[PDB]
Design a protein around this ligand. Sequence first.
Ligand code: CL
Ligand code: MN
Length: 124
Amino acid sequence: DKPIFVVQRHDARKLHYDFRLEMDGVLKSWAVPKEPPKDAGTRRLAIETEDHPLAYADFEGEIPAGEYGAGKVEIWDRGTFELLKREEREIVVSLEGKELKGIYVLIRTKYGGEKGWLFFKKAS
Ligand SMILES: [Cl-]
Ligand SMILES: [Mn+2]
C-alpha cells in the first residue's frame, strides 16, 4: 502492499539513483551513486536528501536548470513495500518491485557532519 517505493535514475551533475520510500504522506529520499543492488552481498552508499511530495513518484521527464533536482528523471523501478522496522539510525523494509524484491536495509553510519547510510539487500 500500500505505501509505495520509487527508484528514479537522476541524470544531474553526475548520474545517480534516487531511492524513495513513502512515509507519513511524503517520500523520504536518498541519493545512491550506483544502481540499487538487486542481490544481497553488495553494499551501497545512500545519502539522505530532502523529502519529495508523493506525486513525484510518478514523475519522468526533465527538471529545468536552477531548480532543486535539476536534470533528467526516469523511473527505474516502482512498487510497494512493507515496513519491518524504523528507528532514527535504521530502516528495514520488504520491497515489492520489478528490479528490487525482498528485504532491504538502511543503516545510518555513526561516523563523521551529516551522516550517510549503508544500503543493502538482506542475505535472507
Ligand atoms: Cl555506492
Ligand atoms: Mn537526485
